[PDB]
Amino acid sequence: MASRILLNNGAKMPILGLGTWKSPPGQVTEAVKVAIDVGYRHIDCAHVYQNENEVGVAIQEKLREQVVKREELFIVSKLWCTYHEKGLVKGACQKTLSDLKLDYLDLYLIHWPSGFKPGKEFFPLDESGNVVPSDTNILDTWAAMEELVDEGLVKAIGISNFNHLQVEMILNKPGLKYKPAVNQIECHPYLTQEKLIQYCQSKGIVVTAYSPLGSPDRPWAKPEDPSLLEDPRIKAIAAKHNKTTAQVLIRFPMQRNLVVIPKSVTPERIAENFKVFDFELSSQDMTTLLSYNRNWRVCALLSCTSHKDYPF
Ligand SMILES: NC(=O)c1ccc[n+]([C@@H]2O[C@H](COP(=O)([O-])OP(=O)(O)OC[C@H]3O[C@@H](n4cnc5c(N)ncnc54)[C@H](OP(=O)(O)O)[C@@H]3O)[C@@H](O)[C@H]2O)c1
Ligand SMILES: O=C(O)COc1cc(Cl)ccc1C(=O)NCc1ccc(Br)cc1F
Ligand SMILES: [Br-]
């Protein structure tokens, strides 16, 4: 399989990247070093993950060692919800750059459509537990993102967790200067996203699938929840191909023309997860995996559901 996908900014993006949410700060430097050593060239980051400094140590060491050139890496981060304000976006991007110890990002995303009240807290709450919004809107935040391209801080801009109507709002923005390059959304066999993916792809927006393994380490996991990695139907497809279930789960979005960003801090799994370019799922396998959709979401959050721009 070709390793990169062409974006609508003219740059190429590796279809496989390393996720870093929940990667402990004392483990993520080694995780990223191992990832780069075994072939990863795309790292998915975010300020809210609280580990960008440690990710950056790894990137910098591998650049210093000349394992890779900067041009060969594709580093992604995301603007957190408490920084949607005009006067805060550049500094948020710059903090991420300094933590990652980069002078540009390959891709910078609006992490969620919703803006929250600025301050120290990532989820500012009222006394009844509702998130405190910002009266910022997605269009003005987008204009701020466009500024970052024009200042040389980022090569591409995009969105994350935007629903169909919100993507459309951006595409219809008066005076739109740069289209979003990417919409990064949850996607796996239990949340197959056919409608949003077709919409975005039809508009030339590349979709990145997050939580492709079903985020078994998500902090809110409950006993009852479905488990992709343990689903005997998916294990059977893996066995047929002499691959792991995780490998099937990673190859699946690749064959849908998606980018995919599985997270691991386990060196053996980091390497396993990369060994997905030498086998093919059949069309029948693909349709079978699609058939498992149950509209089940890892990522949703009750405290934010009354925000005007909550996407789900
Ligand atoms: N834009 C957004 O709003 C958003 C939201 C969610 C996620 N993301 C991004 O997407 C990335 C991936 O999603 P995720 O972290 O939610 O979950 P995920 O990648 O679906 O699953 C990660 C979990 O799977 C385990 N795992 C990894 N490889 C495995 C393998 N080969 N066999 C068995 N278990 C394996 C990991 O364990 P170990 O680490 O212990 O090996 C970890 O517990 C995130 O890290 C983040 O970068 C973005
Ligand atoms: O958002 C992510 O990337 C992964 O999930 C989280 C990560 C961290 Cl470090 C903290 C919290 C989350 C988390 O709770 N994410 C879910 C979330 C967030 C905001 C909104 Br508007 C809706 C929503 F569903
Ligand atoms: Br939101």
Curated annotation (Swiss-Prot):
The keyword Phosphoprotein belongs to this UniProt entry's keyword annotation: yes
Tissue: Highly expressed in embryonic epithelial cells (EUE) in response to osmotic stress.
The protein, known as: Aldo-keto reductase family 1 member B1
The organism's place on the tree of life at top rank: Eukaryota
Keywords: Acetylation, Cytoplasm, Lipid metabolism, NADP, Oxidoreductase, Phosphoprotein
Example of a GO cellular component annotation carried by this entry: mitochondrion
Function per UniProt: Catalyzes the NADPH-dependent reduction of a wide variety of carbonyl-containing compounds to their corresponding alcohols. Displays enzymatic activity towards endogenous metabolites such as aromatic and aliphatic aldehydes, ketones, monosacharides, bile acids and xenobiotics substrates. Key enzyme in the polyol pathway, catalyzes reduction of glucose to sorbitol during hyperglycemia. Reduces steroids and their derivatives and prostaglandins. Displays low enzymatic activity toward all-trans-retinal, 9-cis-retinal, and 13-cis-retinal.
Cellular location(s): Cytoplasm
N6-acetyllysine found at: K95, K222, K263
Family matches, as Pfam families: Aldo_ket_red (PF00248)
Sites marked Lowers pKa of active site Tyr: K78
Catalysed conversion reaction: an alditol + NADP(+) = an aldose + NADPH + H(+); all-trans-retinol + NADP(+) = all-trans-retinal + NADPH + H(+); 9-cis-retinol + NADP(+) = 9-cis-retinal + NADPH + H(+); 13-cis-retinol + NADP(+) = 13-cis-retinal + NADPH + H(+)
Binding-site residues for substrate, renumbered to this chain: H111
GO biological process, one term: doxorubicin metabolic process
EC number: 1.1.1.21, 1.1.1.300, 1.1.1.372, 1.1.1.54
Enzyme class: oxidoreductase
Any one GO molecular-function label of the UniProt entry: electron transfer activity
N-acetylalanine, modified sites: A2
